[PDB]
Amino acid sequence: NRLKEKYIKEVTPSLVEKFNYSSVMQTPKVDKIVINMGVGDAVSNAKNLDKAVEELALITGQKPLITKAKKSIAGFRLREGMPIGAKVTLRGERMYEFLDKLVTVSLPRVRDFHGVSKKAFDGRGNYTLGIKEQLIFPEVDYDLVDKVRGMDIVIVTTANTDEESRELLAQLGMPFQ
Amino acid sequence: STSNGRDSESKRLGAKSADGQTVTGGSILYRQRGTKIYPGVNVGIGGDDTLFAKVDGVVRFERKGRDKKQVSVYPV
Amino acid sequence: MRVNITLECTSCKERNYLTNKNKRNNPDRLEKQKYCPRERKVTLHRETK
Amino acid sequence: MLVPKRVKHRREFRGKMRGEAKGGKEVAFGEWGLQATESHWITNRQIEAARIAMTRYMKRGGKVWIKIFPHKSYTSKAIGVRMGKGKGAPEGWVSPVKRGKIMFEIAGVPEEVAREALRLASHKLPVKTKIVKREEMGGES
Amino acid sequence: ITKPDKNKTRQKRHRRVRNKISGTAECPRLNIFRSNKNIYAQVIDDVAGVTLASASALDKEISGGTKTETAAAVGKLVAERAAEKGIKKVVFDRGGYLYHGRVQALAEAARENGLEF
RNA sequence: UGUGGUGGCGAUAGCGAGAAGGAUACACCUGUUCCCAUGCCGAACACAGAAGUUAAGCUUCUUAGCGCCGAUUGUAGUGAAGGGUUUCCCUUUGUGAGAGUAGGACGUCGCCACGC
RNA sequence: GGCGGUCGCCUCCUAAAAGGUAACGGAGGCGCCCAAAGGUUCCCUCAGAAUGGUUGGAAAUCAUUCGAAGAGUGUAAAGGC
RNA sequence: GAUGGAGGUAGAGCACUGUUUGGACUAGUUCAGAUAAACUCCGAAUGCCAUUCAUUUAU
Ligand SMILES: [Zn+2]
């Protein structure tokens, strides 16, 4: 779609030269994108995962999973298997459209332009964004929203050393500092 | 004035036929809890892990790889 | 809550089996396809009211 | 008195010492040792009495290693009570010591202070003893 | 990330198929290999540890299609060739695959041309 | 011979470090029309393929750092037969460890297919 | 002797490397539960730790890398997996 | 007497669970040293079960 051209036409020559890759298999990629919502409020009101899921599906053409307890802790009134949050996974074209709407439309709606921190790379080459609310997107609306909540993002790639992903990630967008 | 004092009946577990002994079909070879010993050629397992012959032959206790044991029965 | 029970055949009316159930878990009557020895056949047996 | 935190069993058997030490028969951390030549039980109070006597004599400190720990409990019944019902209540702690075991170690102090201190510790104890030094290996400083 | 190889994940299922299936000389073992461009087949007895017949996908002379149709030819070939060696009573080891796709094609062709399963 | 497959034998067969290789084969890789699939996702499993590449798996070769297999002689115990106080200790005769070591070891045996 | 406790059944130690073995010896459980928590066919692999991530904190839920078992097994403990 | 076997005791060991002493360290793992009846990576002497076996003997 939009970036396969961009890879095979701007970036793969760059990255293949910057680290002197003897093969093109060696060039990193983007494998997944996984979205998280930590609700933690089906504890009280059962009608909270519902809105979380409505918003996340307004984003992407995909009904999200439902993550449950996985154990029972009394600090949060948790039994086992109390459905807590929802998640989504994105392959192929769902990833490039979503990255494009992240870099070119949605993200800059956030003010105080701190972009993306750099203590955010796991030490192995995958990256995780951060979002506080939901209003940052053109798929969301004004009134329908009722809570200030936002979503976690993780972008996983095939890279050994962090800096390789640093470049392969800035080169496609994601306006770092 | 003690609160101990109770036990259960002994169960007579162990080996009921020897290595190198000839045996007729159906005879018990070993009573156990769980598989301490495993079943081999021409031997079955019961409902509570007892091992029995299926065929008449001689009994041979062997070694199952590195850390397990086997019983087999071999007809003449 | 657990109660012993009898399942009765539905064509020849012979009580062929004895079994269990929990009657706050299963409120209605059990129903199984069991071999009926009088007719030498598999038949719908049902629990005696 | 030394006491084990958190035992797993409240009572246990006693026997059967049958002397010969299984473990530390050489000096490990100090320069001088106190080795038992008979086999006996040694209690909390005997160890503390010996330790206090040994440390008081060494003005300017030095260092002292106690190498014997009471793991095993006692029990006992009371006067005026007939034989019969279950074990008594636990009263005490002990360690069994077999002949050969080194029990204390001292360093940082010349011979005579160390020898006098080990002499004063042994009169507090129910065993016969010797005094030993680190003798000869690949390296003994 | 580390994608695992598929061949080890199917060795791990093959070793559990084989706790039941095994082949003697009255009832040899019809095995199957399925690679990215072929499928193979051997007829194996295990007390002696040997092969009695075989047929391979695109090694010898099969072609006339390159859909699943390559498999049915191999099934028919091992059927004929094993009936040449006095063999009718084999047992089928799937490998670790499903009895579903182009392994089912080979198996079916085996059952039409001489081998009772 | 080389490679693919499928088997026996207690890892002496394993782990980690290092190199090399694409002849066929093995793989990664490319797609979702059709058989089938995701408690979301063609990721997997299923199928259609053959642009691209030896980077990763795979194969071969070097390495005794980690595991594994370890003798010999000395002890500890203990069958029989005897002696002191009998808590415990000792002497004859037979058996003999666990530790700790000298050494071994980077597999060995077999069937099928194709290529040289 | 009385008062106190105990009286059937299961698991461990005592128990002396087959089986068996006392004491008002040392420790615990049972008098049920499950219509699936039974049968069978396919498929799967755990507990933790470290790193990042908005609410969210040590610890709910996401991603990666180490991880032979340090988990689970309706219910006591042993033997098994 | 010879040959095969089942089994965890006397040792002694710290891989697993309890109990425990010194030292280095750091997050803000390590080096040594002990110990056990209900601990075990290990493991005897003897006893026990067998055998178309052998030599004496009489059950
Ligand atoms: Zn009827």
PDB file of N, CA and C (backbone and C1' of nucleotides) in Angstrom, chain E residues 30-34 38-41 57 62 66-79 92 94 97-113 115 117, chain F residues 35 46-48:
ATOM      1  N   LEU E  30       2.748 -47.179   6.804  1.00  0.00           N
ATOM      2  CA  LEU E  30       2.732 -46.237   5.690  1.00  0.00           C
ATOM      3  C   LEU E  30       2.949 -44.837   6.247  1.00  0.00           C
ATOM      4  N   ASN E  31       4.167 -44.327   6.103  1.00  0.00           N
ATOM      5  CA  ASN E  31       4.560 -43.008   6.570  1.00  0.00           C
ATOM      6  C   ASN E  31       4.348 -41.967   5.472  1.00  0.00           C
ATOM      7  N   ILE E  32       4.584 -40.706   5.813  1.00  0.00           N
ATOM      8  CA  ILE E  32       4.406 -39.598   4.884  1.00  0.00           C
ATOM      9  C   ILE E  32       5.337 -38.470   5.284  1.00  0.00           C
ATOM     10  N   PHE E  33       6.007 -37.894   4.293  1.00  0.00           N
ATOM     11  CA  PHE E  33       6.702 -36.626   4.432  1.00  0.00           C
ATOM     12  C   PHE E  33       6.035 -35.594   3.532  1.00  0.00           C
ATOM     13  N   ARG E  34       5.879 -34.371   4.026  1.00  0.00           N
ATOM     14  CA  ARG E  34       5.267 -33.298   3.250  1.00  0.00           C
ATOM     15  C   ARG E  34       6.138 -32.057   3.337  1.00  0.00           C
ATOM     16  N   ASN E  38       6.762 -30.859  -2.316  1.00  0.00           N
ATOM     17  CA  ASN E  38       6.589 -32.266  -2.645  1.00  0.00           C
ATOM     18  C   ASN E  38       5.868 -32.964  -1.506  1.00  0.00           C
ATOM     19  N   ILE E  39       5.577 -34.247  -1.714  1.00  0.00           N
ATOM     20  CA  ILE E  39       5.210 -35.173  -0.646  1.00  0.00           C
ATOM     21  C   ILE E  39       5.794 -36.538  -0.982  1.00  0.00           C
ATOM     22  N   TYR E  40       6.338 -37.215   0.020  1.00  0.00           N
ATOM     23  CA  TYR E  40       6.958 -38.520  -0.170  1.00  0.00           C
ATOM     24  C   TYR E  40       6.154 -39.584   0.572  1.00  0.00           C
ATOM     25  N   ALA E  41       6.564 -40.848   0.418  1.00  0.00           N
ATOM     26  CA  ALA E  41       5.882 -41.952   1.086  1.00  0.00           C
ATOM     27  C   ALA E  41       6.758 -43.193   1.115  1.00  0.00           C
ATOM     28  N   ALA E  57       7.095 -37.607  -4.865  1.00  0.00           N
ATOM     29  CA  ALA E  57       6.157 -36.709  -5.524  1.00  0.00           C
ATOM     30  C   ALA E  57       6.597 -36.335  -6.918  1.00  0.00           C
ATOM     31  N   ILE E  62       5.529 -38.278 -12.367  1.00  0.00           N
ATOM     32  CA  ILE E  62       4.194 -38.119 -11.820  1.00  0.00           C
ATOM     33  C   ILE E  62       3.367 -37.142 -12.636  1.00  0.00           C
ATOM     34  N   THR E  66      -0.065 -29.426 -10.975  1.00  0.00           N
ATOM     35  CA  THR E  66       0.661 -28.978  -9.796  1.00  0.00           C
ATOM     36  C   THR E  66      -0.268 -28.296  -8.801  1.00  0.00           C
ATOM     37  N   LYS E  67      -1.496 -28.782  -8.677  1.00  0.00           N
ATOM     38  CA  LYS E  67      -2.292 -28.545  -7.483  1.00  0.00           C
ATOM     39  C   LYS E  67      -2.112 -29.746  -6.548  1.00  0.00           C
ATOM     40  N   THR E  68      -3.033 -29.943  -5.581  1.00  0.00           N
ATOM     41  CA  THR E  68      -3.034 -31.144  -4.735  1.00  0.00           C
ATOM     42  C   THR E  68      -2.956 -32.430  -5.541  1.00  0.00           C
ATOM     43  N   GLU E  69      -3.304 -32.378  -6.828  1.00  0.00           N
ATOM     44  CA  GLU E  69      -3.295 -33.523  -7.735  1.00  0.00           C
ATOM     45  C   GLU E  69      -1.962 -34.263  -7.792  1.00  0.00           C
ATOM     46  N   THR E  70      -0.857 -33.633  -7.394  1.00  0.00           N
ATOM     47  CA  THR E  70       0.404 -34.359  -7.388  1.00  0.00           C
ATOM     48  C   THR E  70       0.387 -35.483  -6.365  1.00  0.00           C
ATOM     49  N   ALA E  71      -0.391 -35.319  -5.288  1.00  0.00           N
ATOM     50  CA  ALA E  71      -0.390 -36.282  -4.190  1.00  0.00           C
ATOM     51  C   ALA E  71      -1.105 -37.577  -4.560  1.00  0.00           C
ATOM     52  N   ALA E  72      -2.275 -37.475  -5.189  1.00  0.00           N
ATOM     53  CA  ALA E  72      -3.050 -38.671  -5.498  1.00  0.00           C
ATOM     54  C   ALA E  72      -2.252 -39.634  -6.367  1.00  0.00           C
ATOM     55  N   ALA E  73      -1.451 -39.101  -7.283  1.00  0.00           N
ATOM     56  CA  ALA E  73      -0.579 -39.939  -8.093  1.00  0.00           C
ATOM     57  C   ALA E  73       0.403 -40.722  -7.231  1.00  0.00           C
ATOM     58  N   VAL E  74       0.999 -40.073  -6.232  1.00  0.00           N
ATOM     59  CA  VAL E  74       1.925 -40.770  -5.343  1.00  0.00           C
ATOM     60  C   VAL E  74       1.203 -41.867  -4.567  1.00  0.00           C
ATOM     61  N   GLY E  75       0.001 -41.577  -4.071  1.00  0.00           N
ATOM     62  CA  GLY E  75      -0.772 -42.615  -3.405  1.00  0.00           C
ATOM     63  C   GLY E  75      -0.990 -43.828  -4.291  1.00  0.00           C
ATOM     64  N   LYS E  76      -1.429 -43.586  -5.527  1.00  0.00           N
ATOM     65  CA  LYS E  76      -1.655 -44.678  -6.466  1.00  0.00           C
ATOM     66  C   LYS E  76      -0.365 -45.446  -6.744  1.00  0.00           C
ATOM     67  N   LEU E  77       0.764 -44.737  -6.821  1.00  0.00           N
ATOM     68  CA  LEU E  77       2.039 -45.392  -7.099  1.00  0.00           C
ATOM     69  C   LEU E  77       2.455 -46.325  -5.972  1.00  0.00           C
ATOM     70  N   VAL E  78       2.388 -45.859  -4.719  1.00  0.00           N
ATOM     71  CA  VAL E  78       2.789 -46.756  -3.639  1.00  0.00           C
ATOM     72  C   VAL E  78       1.809 -47.913  -3.529  1.00  0.00           C
ATOM     73  N   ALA E  79       0.530 -47.682  -3.827  1.00  0.00           N
ATOM     74  CA  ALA E  79      -0.421 -48.786  -3.820  1.00  0.00           C
ATOM     75  C   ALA E  79      -0.002 -49.880  -4.797  1.00  0.00           C
ATOM     76  N   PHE E  92      -1.583 -46.401   8.850  1.00  0.00           N
ATOM     77  CA  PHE E  92      -1.273 -45.075   8.323  1.00  0.00           C
ATOM     78  C   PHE E  92      -0.801 -44.119   9.413  1.00  0.00           C
ATOM     79  N   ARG E  94       0.183 -40.368   9.976  1.00  0.00           N
ATOM     80  CA  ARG E  94      -0.020 -39.061   9.363  1.00  0.00           C
ATOM     81  C   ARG E  94       1.234 -38.210   9.320  1.00  0.00           C
ATOM     82  N   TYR E  97       0.827 -34.152  10.770  1.00  0.00           N
ATOM     83  CA  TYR E  97      -0.084 -33.264  10.072  1.00  0.00           C
ATOM     84  C   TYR E  97      -1.525 -33.621  10.429  1.00  0.00           C
ATOM     85  N   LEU E  98      -2.482 -32.931   9.825  1.00  0.00           N
ATOM     86  CA  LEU E  98      -3.882 -33.303   9.952  1.00  0.00           C
ATOM     87  C   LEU E  98      -4.260 -34.256   8.839  1.00  0.00           C
ATOM     88  N   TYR E  99      -5.200 -35.153   9.122  1.00  0.00           N
ATOM     89  CA  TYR E  99      -5.739 -35.993   8.057  1.00  0.00           C
ATOM     90  C   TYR E  99      -6.728 -35.176   7.224  1.00  0.00           C
ATOM     91  N   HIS E 100      -6.214 -34.161   6.539  1.00  0.00           N
ATOM     92  CA  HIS E 100      -7.214 -33.260   5.978  1.00  0.00           C
ATOM     93  C   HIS E 100      -7.006 -32.862   4.525  1.00  0.00           C
ATOM     94  N   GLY E 101      -5.786 -32.571   4.108  1.00  0.00           N
ATOM     95  CA  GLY E 101      -5.638 -31.794   2.892  1.00  0.00           C
ATOM     96  C   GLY E 101      -5.115 -32.554   1.700  1.00  0.00           C
ATOM     97  N   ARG E 102      -3.814 -32.431   1.426  1.00  0.00           N
ATOM     98  CA  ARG E 102      -3.161 -33.269   0.438  1.00  0.00           C
ATOM     99  C   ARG E 102      -2.505 -34.508   1.028  1.00  0.00           C
ATOM    100  N   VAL E 103      -2.566 -34.701   2.348  1.00  0.00           N
ATOM    101  CA  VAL E 103      -2.267 -36.011   2.917  1.00  0.00           C
ATOM    102  C   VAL E 103      -3.476 -36.931   2.795  1.00  0.00           C
ATOM    103  N   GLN E 104      -4.680 -36.373   2.929  1.00  0.00           N
ATOM    104  CA  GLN E 104      -5.886 -37.154   2.696  1.00  0.00           C
ATOM    105  C   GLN E 104      -5.975 -37.636   1.254  1.00  0.00           C
ATOM    106  N   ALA E 105      -5.474 -36.848   0.300  1.00  0.00           N
ATOM    107  CA  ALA E 105      -5.475 -37.265  -1.102  1.00  0.00           C
ATOM    108  C   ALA E 105      -4.610 -38.501  -1.329  1.00  0.00           C
ATOM    109  N   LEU E 106      -3.379 -38.480  -0.814  1.00  0.00           N
ATOM    110  CA  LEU E 106      -2.498 -39.640  -0.911  1.00  0.00           C
ATOM    111  C   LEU E 106      -3.122 -40.854  -0.243  1.00  0.00           C
ATOM    112  N   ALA E 107      -3.699 -40.666   0.945  1.00  0.00           N
ATOM    113  CA  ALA E 107      -4.290 -41.791   1.665  1.00  0.00           C
ATOM    114  C   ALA E 107      -5.441 -42.408   0.883  1.00  0.00           C
ATOM    115  N   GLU E 108      -6.346 -41.566   0.383  1.00  0.00           N
ATOM    116  CA  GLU E 108      -7.476 -42.054  -0.393  1.00  0.00           C
ATOM    117  C   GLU E 108      -7.019 -42.827  -1.618  1.00  0.00           C
ATOM    118  N   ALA E 109      -6.087 -42.262  -2.391  1.00  0.00           N
ATOM    119  CA  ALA E 109      -5.570 -43.002  -3.535  1.00  0.00           C
ATOM    120  C   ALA E 109      -4.963 -44.332  -3.116  1.00  0.00           C
ATOM    121  N   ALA E 110      -4.363 -44.402  -1.927  1.00  0.00           N
ATOM    122  CA  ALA E 110      -3.884 -45.690  -1.441  1.00  0.00           C
ATOM    123  C   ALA E 110      -5.029 -46.671  -1.263  1.00  0.00           C
ATOM    124  N   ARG E 111      -6.168 -46.198  -0.766  1.00  0.00           N
ATOM    125  CA  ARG E 111      -7.262 -47.114  -0.466  1.00  0.00           C
ATOM    126  C   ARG E 111      -8.048 -47.577  -1.687  1.00  0.00           C
ATOM    127  N   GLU E 112      -7.787 -47.037  -2.871  1.00  0.00           N
ATOM    128  CA  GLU E 112      -8.490 -47.486  -4.061  1.00  0.00           C
ATOM    129  C   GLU E 112      -7.719 -48.517  -4.854  1.00  0.00           C
ATOM    130  N   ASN E 113      -6.416 -48.622  -4.636  1.00  0.00           N
ATOM    131  CA  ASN E 113      -5.564 -49.377  -5.534  1.00  0.00           C
ATOM    132  C   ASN E 113      -4.840 -50.523  -4.843  1.00  0.00           C
ATOM    133  N   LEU E 115      -4.375 -51.238  -0.887  1.00  0.00           N
ATOM    134  CA  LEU E 115      -3.919 -51.311   0.495  1.00  0.00           C
ATOM    135  C   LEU E 115      -5.103 -51.133   1.443  1.00  0.00           C
ATOM    136  N   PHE E 117      -6.604 -50.425   5.002  1.00  0.00           N
ATOM    137  CA  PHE E 117      -6.093 -49.722   6.166  1.00  0.00           C
ATOM    138  C   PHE E 117      -6.766 -50.230   7.426  1.00  0.00           C
TER     139      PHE E 117
ATOM    140  P     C F  35     -14.030 -23.312  -0.921  1.00  0.00           P
ATOM    141  O5'   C F  35     -13.379 -24.745  -1.165  1.00  0.00           O
ATOM    142  C5'   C F  35     -14.073 -25.933  -0.813  1.00  0.00           C
ATOM    143  C4'   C F  35     -13.234 -26.839   0.054  1.00  0.00           C
ATOM    144  C3'   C F  35     -13.118 -26.453   1.517  1.00  0.00           C
ATOM    145  O3'   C F  35     -14.245 -26.844   2.286  1.00  0.00           O
ATOM    146  C1'   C F  35     -10.976 -26.975   0.672  1.00  0.00           C
ATOM    147  P     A F  46      -1.570 -27.545   7.818  1.00  0.00           P
ATOM    148  O5'   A F  46      -2.810 -26.816   7.137  1.00  0.00           O
ATOM    149  C5'   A F  46      -4.078 -27.437   6.999  1.00  0.00           C
ATOM    150  C4'   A F  46      -4.805 -26.896   5.797  1.00  0.00           C
ATOM    151  C3'   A F  46      -4.009 -26.821   4.510  1.00  0.00           C
ATOM    152  O3'   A F  46      -3.925 -28.049   3.822  1.00  0.00           O
ATOM    153  C1'   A F  46      -5.139 -24.793   4.831  1.00  0.00           C
ATOM    154  P     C F  47      -2.773 -28.278   2.733  1.00  0.00           P
ATOM    155  O5'   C F  47      -3.170 -27.326   1.516  1.00  0.00           O
ATOM    156  C5'   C F  47      -4.257 -27.629   0.654  1.00  0.00           C
ATOM    157  C4'   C F  47      -4.720 -26.413  -0.112  1.00  0.00           C
ATOM    158  C3'   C F  47      -3.808 -25.944  -1.232  1.00  0.00           C
ATOM    159  O3'   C F  47      -4.006 -26.647  -2.437  1.00  0.00           O
ATOM    160  C1'   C F  47      -4.415 -24.099   0.101  1.00  0.00           C
ATOM    161  P     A F  48      -2.815 -26.755  -3.497  1.00  0.00           P
ATOM    162  O5'   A F  48      -2.736 -25.308  -4.179  1.00  0.00           O
ATOM    163  C5'   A F  48      -3.755 -24.808  -5.040  1.00  0.00           C
ATOM    164  C4'   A F  48      -3.393 -23.459  -5.633  1.00  0.00           C
ATOM    165  C3'   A F  48      -2.025 -23.341  -6.307  1.00  0.00           C
ATOM    166  O3'   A F  48      -2.042 -23.769  -7.657  1.00  0.00           O
ATOM    167  C1'   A F  48      -2.350 -21.513  -4.840  1.00  0.00           C
TER     168        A F  48
END
